[PDB]
Amino acid sequence: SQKPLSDDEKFLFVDKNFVNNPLAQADWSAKKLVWVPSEKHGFEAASIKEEKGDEVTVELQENGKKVTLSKDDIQKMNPPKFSKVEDMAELTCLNEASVLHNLRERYFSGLIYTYSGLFCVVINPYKQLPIYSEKIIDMYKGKKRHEMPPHIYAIADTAYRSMLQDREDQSILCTGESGAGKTENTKKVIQYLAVVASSHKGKKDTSITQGPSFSYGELEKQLLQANPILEAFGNAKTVKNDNSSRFGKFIRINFDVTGYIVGANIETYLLEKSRAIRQAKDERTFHIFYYLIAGASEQMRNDLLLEGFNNYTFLSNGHVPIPAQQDDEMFQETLEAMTIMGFTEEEQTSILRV
Amino acid sequence: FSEEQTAEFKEAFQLFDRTGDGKILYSQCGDVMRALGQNPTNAEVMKVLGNPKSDEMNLKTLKFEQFLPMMQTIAKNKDQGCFEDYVEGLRVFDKEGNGTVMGAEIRHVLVTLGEKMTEEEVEQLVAGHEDSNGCINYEELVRMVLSG
Amino acid sequence: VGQLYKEQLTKLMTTLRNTNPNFVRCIIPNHEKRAGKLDAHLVLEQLRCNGVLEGIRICRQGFPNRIVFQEFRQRYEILAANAIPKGFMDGKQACILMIKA
Amino acid sequence: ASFLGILDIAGFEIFEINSFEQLCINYTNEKLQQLFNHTMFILEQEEYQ
């Protein structure tokens, strides 16, 4: 069949090295297989046992249960060839049930990026996946849209490598409801071009830590570290999202004529500055409030007159913690972000007493 | 040919015996012709040797008098390469338009396509022309093979 | 303030209509914040209100492409090199001759 | 040169108290879906005509 797949690799690449089973090929005799509507499943699989004109008698394969339903209830089941397909445009039966089935069986197999013609569908995994790593970057770098499975890096190279072929300025537009994962994909697009379209001055040094193992450029280091500073002075936990974007942002990355990064500009829209004073039930304020009250060193704690949790009337709900984050070390992280970006040692203390 | 350079071709032909009975193997024949400047395809040499197999290429022997008309046949070909065509094919693999191909891609194309080189042949060709980033200017790489 | 926000929103929208626009459509799988859980109707509605089925409809029976006669002649002549005669000819007619070659 | 724009907008959000800030946030999402509707279905077909 094909090359074998590593464990990490199986979260982007479909398993296709199996025996050519006669079972689902033989089952094809049930050419009265269809999708029928389901309260639990959205659509479930079932087989037509008579057609009565306008109505159709159907039997659920799953549960053995004969039903009568409409001739327009029944949606058109795809051949077992199309199981976990990369693009929705390849599907012979484009049905609402089939798109739901292909996303569902991809999602539970861990494949969270699926193409859909000229745009993609990305489902939030709520799970750390290995697919974001410095191995994966040089696999997608320069590599065509059908030579690798769909991924945010593929879209990021595709925009970069259309712009230098047509010569039209590009936007990558993240859509979706509140908690959908747009901010993380936005950070993945910036991560990709911060090493693909960056100017290089030499390799080394590698620490003793994890491996995002690349010596990113001087500007590109600052561009990488721009996002956590604005997440500190701008993200807050809501009921829906525990690092909820409480401002909107448009990041314009500028290029030369060769195609290398030369500048970047961040425009910004609606800041929910109303939640600084009072918060909704079970919600947090702007993260920097938690980071500064917890993580401030004993000398600066008296200098900036920082009083404890529940000693400030602009913290409602008391001391709401955040799950999978420790606010104490996030103060050190966001201080290290400010030093790397280019803020002076006194200049940073001036920010904190505000 | 003039006798002038045909005399030089005798000295070069004597410099590819390893023994002393004045015979160049069919396996060695292309690379004798390449020593005397020529740049033939493998299928251009093979054709003038009558299309032998790999086994008999070791065992079949040429003298100078029978080697010399082979030189005269391959000397006037119906085409030859230039700079203008040869950069155009390598610039397809120039990822942004940089003036440079990655040394891995250049090693991979020469082995995988056409008259397929060994890994040793590509490594000897490209080494010391790839920078700190492993990137090769195709411009000077073409000038290096064409002009000497 | 309503007018003041609207004034920069039209500014953004003007730039995004003067840029090629790659849509990364992020979908929420459940409100319960569970890894490994998918609520079928909740995703199905997101497919409906984002217009996904309708977007795939053009994907496979358009037309997204998109090449002028000169660039098609210039980059593809190598494939069809005896199709266009050695005398000057119309760009539309020349492209039709290589398409039928 | 040229540029790459990347857009992160506050998503469609609804709570027990929906205020003017949420009105402006949801309005921006209405515009973003409309931008997709206009590029994908309208501008594509105009070019064919």
XYZ file of C-alpha atoms in Angstrom:
652
model
C 0.000 0.000 0.000
C 1.729 3.229 1.124
C 4.472 4.327 3.575
C 3.657 3.562 7.306
C 2.594 6.428 9.629
C 4.106 7.473 12.986
C 1.867 8.040 16.058
C 2.264 11.883 15.859
C 1.730 11.730 12.050
C -1.663 9.944 12.442
C -3.111 13.266 13.729
C -2.680 14.658 10.182
C -2.431 11.571 7.892
C -5.297 9.088 7.265
C -4.710 5.344 7.818
C -4.911 3.619 4.397
C -2.684 0.531 4.923
C -5.389 -2.044 5.638
C -6.691 -5.095 3.759
C -9.105 -4.442 0.841
C -12.073 -5.913 2.779
C -14.932 -7.503 0.744
C -17.319 -6.668 3.634
C -18.211 -3.020 2.885
C -17.880 -3.791 -0.846
C -20.446 -6.655 -0.547
C -22.729 -4.549 1.717
C -23.064 -2.122 -1.281
C -25.994 -4.394 -2.378
C -28.000 -2.364 0.135
C -28.189 0.469 -2.501
C -31.190 1.589 -0.492
C -28.855 2.871 2.282
C -29.628 6.497 3.171
C -29.228 8.912 6.068
C -32.372 9.570 8.174
C -32.777 12.401 10.775
C -31.817 11.655 14.399
C -32.296 13.535 17.695
C -29.029 12.159 19.172
C -26.847 11.849 16.073
C -28.227 14.597 13.748
C -28.439 11.933 11.070
C -28.112 8.137 11.463
C -27.728 5.395 8.824
C -30.734 3.430 7.581
C -31.923 1.328 4.619
C -35.080 1.852 2.476
C -37.424 -1.165 2.519
C -40.250 0.180 0.349
C -41.105 3.499 -1.357
C -44.800 4.417 -1.169
C -44.693 7.402 -3.517
C -44.465 10.468 -1.269
C -43.549 8.428 1.865
C -40.753 5.849 2.240
C -40.503 2.898 4.691
C -36.973 2.800 6.149
C -35.187 0.471 8.614
C -32.432 1.813 10.917
C -29.310 -0.352 10.422
C -28.018 0.664 13.884
C -31.088 -0.336 15.900
C -33.159 -2.658 13.605
C -36.156 -0.364 13.907
C -38.582 0.008 10.976
C -39.962 3.551 10.491
C -41.967 5.348 7.766
C -40.536 8.777 6.853
C -40.796 11.191 3.882
C -39.124 10.794 0.459
C -37.380 14.124 1.207
C -36.290 13.135 4.809
C -33.859 10.587 3.336
C -30.386 12.002 2.456
C -28.028 10.220 0.055
C -25.349 7.966 1.613
C -21.827 8.050 0.075
C -19.751 4.919 -0.879
C -17.202 3.640 1.776
C -14.404 4.983 -0.510
C -15.100 8.504 0.855
C -14.462 7.579 4.546
C -12.485 10.471 6.165
C -11.907 12.395 2.887
C -9.462 15.396 2.933
C -11.754 17.789 1.017
C -15.562 17.988 1.062
C -15.494 18.964 -2.657
C -14.594 15.342 -3.598
C -17.894 13.999 -2.145
C -20.312 12.739 -4.867
C -23.237 13.163 -2.468
C -22.982 16.626 -0.893
C -25.582 16.191 1.829
C -25.887 17.902 5.230
C -25.681 14.462 6.852
C -22.566 13.497 4.800
C -20.653 16.706 5.683
C -21.596 16.102 9.364
C -20.463 12.432 9.107
C -17.117 13.288 7.440
C -16.328 16.020 10.020
C -17.469 13.751 12.902
C -15.477 10.637 11.940
C -12.451 12.889 11.147
C -12.821 14.707 14.540
C -12.962 11.436 16.536
C -9.935 10.191 14.524
C -8.251 13.503 15.570
C -8.060 15.124 12.107
C -9.381 18.614 12.974
C -8.581 20.387 9.671
C -10.707 19.449 6.631
C -10.755 21.324 3.305
C -14.123 22.412 1.903
C -13.336 23.526 -1.663
C -11.668 26.960 -1.394
C -11.967 27.431 2.388
C -11.509 25.009 5.303
C -13.420 23.749 8.329
C -11.426 23.601 11.601
C -13.048 21.995 14.681
C -11.597 22.994 18.118
C -9.998 19.810 19.672
C -9.812 21.202 23.256
C -6.685 18.959 23.449
C -2.957 19.566 22.909
C -2.175 17.892 19.534
C 1.460 17.306 18.339
C 0.693 18.862 14.902
C 2.198 22.247 15.878
C 5.984 21.557 15.946
C 9.199 22.657 14.144
C 9.367 19.268 12.313
C 5.966 20.030 10.732
C 6.993 23.515 9.460
C 9.735 22.289 7.069
C 7.366 19.507 5.866
C 4.769 22.117 4.690
C 7.381 24.718 3.536
C 7.081 25.134 -0.269
C 4.939 21.990 -0.422
C 1.751 21.826 -2.565
C -1.911 21.761 -1.324
C -2.505 18.082 -2.306
C 1.021 16.862 -1.386
C 0.259 17.111 2.359
C -3.024 16.696 4.338
C -4.918 19.951 5.223
C -3.403 22.086 8.001
C -3.196 25.778 9.112
C 0.442 25.781 7.918
C -0.777 24.684 4.430
C -3.148 27.695 4.232
C -0.387 29.997 5.535
C 2.113 28.781 2.840
C -0.690 28.909 0.194
C -1.441 32.599 0.894
C 2.311 33.462 1.066
C 3.033 31.574 -2.194
C -0.005 32.999 -4.077
C 0.971 36.603 -3.141
C 4.407 36.109 -4.742
C 2.845 34.536 -7.895
C -0.062 36.857 -8.773
C 1.139 39.926 -6.777
C -2.110 40.630 -4.879
C -2.127 41.430 -1.129
C -3.614 38.639 1.005
C -5.878 38.332 4.046
C -6.316 35.225 6.207
C -9.761 35.540 7.764
C -10.603 33.503 10.867
C -14.417 33.018 11.284
C -16.530 31.255 13.959
C -18.522 31.810 17.177
C -16.991 32.787 20.598
C -14.651 29.964 21.765
C -14.166 28.460 18.294
C -10.305 28.802 18.189
C -9.628 31.735 15.815
C -6.985 33.299 18.127
C -4.961 30.050 18.260
C -5.077 29.665 14.430
C -4.074 33.387 14.150
C -1.048 32.617 16.365
C -0.271 29.504 14.209
C -0.253 31.629 10.973
C 2.163 34.143 12.619
C 4.293 31.224 13.961
C 4.561 29.727 10.452
C 5.645 32.936 8.664
C 7.993 33.912 11.560
C 10.262 31.004 10.448
C 9.280 30.482 6.753
C 9.422 34.126 5.570
C 12.088 35.218 8.080
C 15.633 36.404 7.420
C 18.209 34.048 8.860
C 21.462 34.928 10.640
C 22.587 31.528 11.975
C 21.559 28.350 13.795
C 22.155 27.583 17.579
C 21.342 27.403 20.602
C 18.752 24.846 21.761
C 18.540 25.025 25.624
C 17.481 21.965 27.740
C 13.724 22.669 27.392
C 11.150 21.481 24.761
C 11.903 21.783 20.997
C 10.540 24.779 19.089
C 14.179 24.405 18.029
C 14.841 27.442 15.805
C 16.848 30.668 16.262
C 14.130 33.059 14.880
C 15.340 36.510 13.553
C 15.649 39.795 15.516
C 12.349 41.317 14.283
C 10.710 37.880 14.170
C 11.425 37.264 17.910
C 9.593 40.543 18.712
C 6.701 39.656 16.334
C 6.385 36.195 17.974
C 6.197 37.807 21.464
C 3.679 40.558 20.494
C 0.588 38.344 21.125
C 1.147 37.356 24.878
C 1.541 41.055 25.862
C -1.860 41.859 24.323
C -3.317 38.623 25.812
C -2.112 39.934 29.243
C -3.505 43.486 28.829
C -6.595 42.265 26.950
C -7.753 38.662 27.452
C -10.117 37.665 30.252
C -12.021 34.507 31.262
C -15.728 34.399 30.377
C -18.241 31.544 30.819
C -17.580 30.467 27.170
C -13.768 30.866 26.949
C -11.193 30.964 29.772
C -8.741 33.004 27.668
C -11.472 34.949 25.813
C -10.336 37.658 23.361
C -11.828 40.843 24.839
C -10.606 42.973 21.967
C -10.457 42.328 18.189
C -7.263 42.686 16.186
C -6.046 42.892 12.573
C -2.373 41.958 12.141
C -0.822 43.288 8.903
C 2.537 41.602 8.142
C 4.614 43.580 5.565
C 7.072 41.971 3.059
C 9.918 43.138 0.788
C 10.089 42.510 -3.033
C 12.151 39.312 -2.533
C 9.408 38.094 -0.133
C 11.045 38.453 3.305
C 9.366 39.966 6.431
C 10.203 43.683 6.899
C 7.501 45.141 9.212
C 4.214 44.435 10.977
C 1.268 46.606 12.069
C -1.562 45.718 14.546
C -4.905 47.603 14.290
C -7.429 47.102 17.132
C -11.179 47.425 17.526
C -13.691 46.918 20.395
C -12.040 46.641 23.846
C -14.549 45.519 26.546
C -13.104 48.115 29.030
C -16.436 47.904 30.911
C -15.384 44.599 32.547
C -12.356 46.235 34.268
C -14.606 47.683 37.008
C -17.164 44.825 37.451
C -17.294 41.264 36.062
C -20.213 38.934 35.259
C -21.037 35.878 37.444
C -18.177 33.247 37.395
C -15.991 35.458 35.134
C -12.517 37.021 35.471
C -11.159 40.509 34.742
C -8.260 41.276 32.348
C -5.585 38.696 33.201
C -2.826 41.205 34.136
C -4.915 41.985 37.305
C -4.521 38.351 38.516
C -0.881 38.124 37.335
C 0.154 41.351 39.117
C -1.626 40.653 42.459
C -0.247 37.072 42.629
C 3.225 37.313 40.992
C 4.603 40.687 42.178
C 7.892 40.480 44.183
C 7.828 41.587 47.872
C 9.763 44.861 47.280
C 7.487 46.040 44.408
C 4.359 44.830 46.280
C 4.713 47.734 48.779
C 6.088 50.253 46.118
C 3.018 49.891 43.845
C 0.662 49.505 46.882
C -0.673 46.107 45.784
C -3.281 44.819 48.255
C -4.519 41.178 48.244
C -7.285 39.209 46.548
C -10.733 40.314 47.854
C -9.192 43.661 49.023
C -10.125 45.331 45.704
C -13.821 46.145 44.997
C -13.169 45.921 41.217
C -12.661 42.150 41.595
C -16.111 40.499 41.720
C -16.596 36.711 42.241
C -13.547 36.802 44.611
C -10.525 34.836 43.367
C -11.793 32.910 40.327
C -8.925 30.568 39.208
C -8.340 29.496 35.591
C -8.066 25.803 34.489
C -4.670 24.671 33.082
C -3.024 28.023 33.887
C -1.158 29.345 36.969
C -1.362 33.155 37.231
C 1.841 33.385 39.375
C 4.217 32.136 36.597
C 2.198 33.926 33.873
C 3.401 37.184 35.496
C 6.994 36.032 34.835
C 5.999 34.953 31.269
C 4.425 38.337 30.415
C 7.405 40.205 31.972
C 9.735 38.077 29.758
C 7.470 38.908 26.788
C 7.871 42.685 27.473
C 11.713 42.470 27.783
C 11.979 40.462 24.499
C 9.628 42.850 22.633
C 11.584 45.963 23.729
C 10.321 47.533 26.970
C 12.807 49.219 29.409
C 13.261 47.915 33.020
C 11.803 51.099 34.704
C 9.269 51.538 31.831
C 7.712 48.168 32.764
C 7.262 49.188 36.465
C 5.526 52.400 35.271
C 3.003 50.213 33.348
C 2.256 48.140 36.502
C 1.519 51.154 38.818
C -1.121 52.196 36.244
C 39.434 16.420 -37.409
C 42.991 17.616 -38.193
C 46.037 15.339 -37.517
C 47.248 18.023 -35.031
C 44.424 17.345 -32.508
C 44.082 13.661 -33.605
C 47.667 13.227 -32.302
C 46.543 14.715 -28.938
C 43.618 12.224 -28.928
C 46.185 9.378 -29.281
C 48.034 10.585 -26.116
C 44.745 10.889 -24.174
C 43.596 7.438 -25.427
C 46.900 5.904 -24.191
C 46.251 7.544 -20.787
C 43.115 5.419 -20.155
C 44.797 1.989 -20.398
C 45.433 0.618 -16.886
C 47.629 -2.227 -18.184
C 49.648 -1.887 -21.411
C 47.966 -3.619 -24.366
C 46.454 -0.455 -25.708
C 42.757 -1.133 -25.203
C 39.945 0.972 -23.725
C 36.900 -0.908 -22.398
C 33.349 -0.235 -23.694
C 32.509 0.763 -20.068
C 35.272 3.379 -20.157
C 34.406 4.714 -23.663
C 32.063 7.606 -22.672
C 34.458 9.011 -20.172
C 37.370 8.941 -22.675
C 35.160 11.035 -25.011
C 34.311 13.342 -22.058
C 38.073 13.699 -21.295
C 38.494 15.053 -24.861
C 36.051 17.787 -24.072
C 32.806 16.214 -25.323
C 29.518 16.226 -23.318
C 27.447 13.246 -24.640
C 24.301 11.697 -23.157
C 24.594 8.036 -22.118
C 22.226 7.073 -24.902
C 24.440 8.935 -27.462
C 27.524 6.847 -26.488
C 25.582 3.553 -26.220
C 24.215 3.860 -29.779
C 27.709 4.101 -31.382
C 28.840 1.046 -29.335
C 25.880 -0.857 -30.908
C 23.737 -1.091 -27.734
C 25.727 -3.706 -25.661
C 24.515 -5.135 -22.336
C 26.118 -4.377 -18.905
C 28.082 -7.681 -18.740
C 29.773 -7.341 -22.188
C 30.482 -3.591 -21.557
C 33.278 -4.736 -19.112
C 34.644 -7.365 -21.542
C 34.471 -5.584 -24.943
C 37.552 -3.588 -25.991
C 38.242 -0.615 -28.306
C 41.490 0.356 -30.004
C 42.206 3.951 -31.176
C 41.420 3.362 -34.904
C 37.878 2.124 -34.071
C 37.401 4.661 -31.195
C 38.278 7.573 -33.561
C 35.164 7.346 -35.916
C 33.019 7.280 -32.707
C 34.623 10.619 -31.739
C 33.873 11.881 -35.280
C 30.181 10.772 -35.058
C 29.516 12.383 -31.639
C 31.571 15.543 -32.463
C 28.906 16.819 -34.894
C 25.608 16.532 -33.043
C 22.393 18.287 -34.174
C 22.036 20.500 -31.079
C 24.059 21.442 -27.982
C 23.099 23.158 -24.668
C 23.506 26.770 -23.507
C 23.051 28.931 -20.381
C 19.665 30.350 -21.404
C 17.818 26.982 -21.404
C 19.675 25.431 -18.440
C 18.923 28.188 -15.896
C 15.255 28.181 -16.983
C 14.825 24.533 -15.876
C 16.604 25.079 -12.529
C 14.685 28.314 -11.777
C 11.460 26.208 -11.537
C 12.875 24.941 -8.205
C 13.708 28.469 -6.989
C 11.078 28.643 -4.222
C 10.523 32.456 -4.000
C 12.648 33.617 -6.952
C 15.734 34.072 -4.737
C 18.371 33.129 -7.334
C 18.984 30.001 -5.210
C 17.705 26.384 -5.044
C 17.906 24.381 -1.763
C 20.818 21.837 -1.889
C 18.473 18.969 -0.974
C 16.081 19.728 -3.913
C 19.034 20.001 -6.385
C 20.464 16.648 -5.129
C 16.955 15.103 -5.454
C 16.094 16.282 -9.012
C 19.332 15.103 -10.693
C 18.989 11.623 -9.102
C 15.183 11.256 -9.746
C 14.776 12.645 -13.319
C 16.247 11.839 -16.814
C 19.816 10.232 -17.020
C 19.629 9.642 -13.202
C 22.862 10.293 -11.302
C 24.159 8.403 -8.258
C 24.113 10.047 -4.812
C 27.958 10.244 -5.070
C 27.800 12.071 -8.433
C 25.464 14.794 -7.089
C 27.406 15.172 -3.788
C 30.727 15.690 -5.708
C 28.983 18.175 -8.054
C 27.253 20.458 -5.521
C 29.603 20.479 -2.491
C 31.190 23.873 -1.584
C 28.632 25.780 -3.698
C 25.888 25.495 -1.043
C 26.046 28.252 1.597
C 25.420 28.310 5.414
C 21.677 27.834 4.711
C 22.442 25.024 2.212
C 21.365 27.168 -0.740
C 22.920 27.001 -4.244
C 22.999 29.787 -6.834
C 21.966 28.002 -10.085
C 23.575 30.791 -12.235
C 27.156 29.980 -11.117
C 26.384 26.213 -10.875
C 25.551 26.248 -14.655
C 28.717 28.352 -15.383
C 30.778 25.837 -13.307
C 29.694 22.830 -15.447
C 29.556 24.604 -18.860
C 32.765 26.676 -18.736
C 35.083 24.312 -16.924
C -18.872 56.054 20.075
C -21.228 54.057 17.752
C -20.247 56.245 14.810
C -16.560 56.270 15.920
C -16.320 52.428 15.841
C -18.269 52.263 12.514
C -15.769 54.721 10.939
C -12.811 52.334 11.586
C -14.929 49.236 10.682
C -15.516 50.587 7.111
C -11.752 51.326 7.006
C -11.029 47.609 7.776
C -13.752 46.396 5.365
C -12.295 48.577 2.557
C -8.861 46.916 2.975
C -10.397 43.379 3.126
C -12.236 44.037 -0.179
C -8.903 45.098 -1.751
C -7.157 41.877 -0.587
C -7.431 38.238 -1.650
C -9.284 36.554 1.304
C -8.570 33.049 2.666
C -11.374 31.902 5.035
C -10.276 29.767 8.022
C -13.621 28.665 9.454
C -13.293 27.671 13.114
C -16.127 25.550 14.604
C -16.980 25.083 18.308
C -17.716 21.336 19.039
C -19.555 21.640 22.372
C -20.369 24.262 25.071
C -19.484 21.894 27.940
C -15.754 22.382 27.220
C -15.040 18.678 26.730
C -12.123 17.297 24.746
C -13.452 14.305 22.726
C -17.122 15.360 22.738
C -19.028 16.484 19.638
C -22.601 17.805 19.791
C -24.051 16.915 16.346
C -26.837 19.531 15.981
C -24.626 22.296 17.475
C -21.985 21.738 14.737
C -24.723 21.136 12.095
C -26.264 24.573 12.788
C -22.762 26.141 12.482
C -22.481 24.465 9.027
C -25.890 26.003 8.155
C -25.314 29.584 9.423
C -21.767 29.814 7.986
C -23.143 28.569 4.574
C -20.752 25.622 4.170
C -22.899 23.388 1.869
C -23.586 26.360 -0.458
C -19.851 27.238 -0.442
C -18.903 23.680 -1.498
C -21.613 23.817 -4.246
C -19.477 26.188 -6.421
C -16.234 24.340 -5.457
C -16.698 21.433 -8.022
C -19.015 23.014 -10.630
C -17.329 26.389 -11.074
C -15.151 28.060 -12.390
C -12.692 29.639 -9.794
C -9.756 29.896 -12.247
C -8.818 32.294 -13.922
C -6.183 32.770 -16.630
C -5.753 35.546 -19.241
C -5.057 34.495 -22.882
C -1.478 35.872 -22.834
C -0.281 33.996 -19.678
C -1.979 30.778 -20.897
C -0.219 31.185 -24.285
C 3.125 32.071 -22.635
C 3.393 29.308 -20.014
C 1.790 26.429 -21.996
C 3.137 26.854 -25.618
C 5.817 24.246 -24.794
C 3.021 21.590 -24.555
C 1.503 22.413 -27.974
C 4.410 23.917 -29.955
C 3.113 23.160 -33.506
C -0.481 24.301 -32.756
C 0.157 28.032 -33.369
C 1.768 28.879 -36.794
C 5.041 30.820 -37.335
C 3.121 34.031 -38.291
C 1.380 36.445 -35.887
C -2.123 35.510 -34.661
C -4.966 36.629 -32.314
C -4.570 35.812 -28.572
C -8.058 34.306 -28.211
C -7.727 32.264 -31.441
C -4.189 31.110 -30.491
C -5.334 29.918 -27.041
C -8.280 27.979 -28.638
C -5.831 26.248 -31.057
C -3.586 24.999 -28.190
C -6.715 23.906 -26.180
C -7.769 21.785 -29.205
C -4.166 20.544 -29.691
C 5.991 45.970 -0.845
C 3.109 43.468 -0.309
C 1.223 42.380 2.845
C -0.478 39.478 4.639
C -3.476 40.496 6.780
C -4.593 38.198 9.612
C -7.928 38.882 11.332
C -8.899 37.782 14.865
C -12.360 39.127 15.746
C -14.349 38.599 18.958
C -16.778 35.784 18.054
C -20.552 35.684 18.136
C -21.334 35.831 21.876
C -24.433 35.804 24.034
C -24.817 35.911 27.823
C -27.590 36.637 30.363
C -26.708 40.360 30.095
C -26.197 41.395 26.451
C -24.974 45.005 26.382
C -23.901 47.585 23.711
C -20.366 46.096 23.637
C -21.887 42.669 22.684
C -24.127 44.512 20.151
C -21.020 45.919 18.415
C -19.214 42.516 18.686
C -22.135 40.565 17.120
C -22.586 43.297 14.417
C -18.946 42.683 13.374
C -19.688 38.919 13.014
C -22.804 39.743 10.867
C -20.432 41.753 8.616
C -17.809 38.942 8.464
C -20.385 36.316 7.327
C -21.762 38.890 4.818
C -18.189 39.382 3.467
C -18.039 35.591 2.787
C -21.535 35.680 1.179
C -20.498 38.565 -1.080
C -17.094 37.100 -2.158
C -18.148 33.433 -2.511
C -21.527 33.712 -4.267
C -21.987 37.229 -5.672
C -18.535 38.458 -6.883
C -17.688 35.005 -8.325
C -20.858 34.994 -10.507
C -20.487 38.682 -11.523
C -17.076 37.793 -13.034
C -18.756 35.033 -15.097
C -21.353 37.564 -16.417
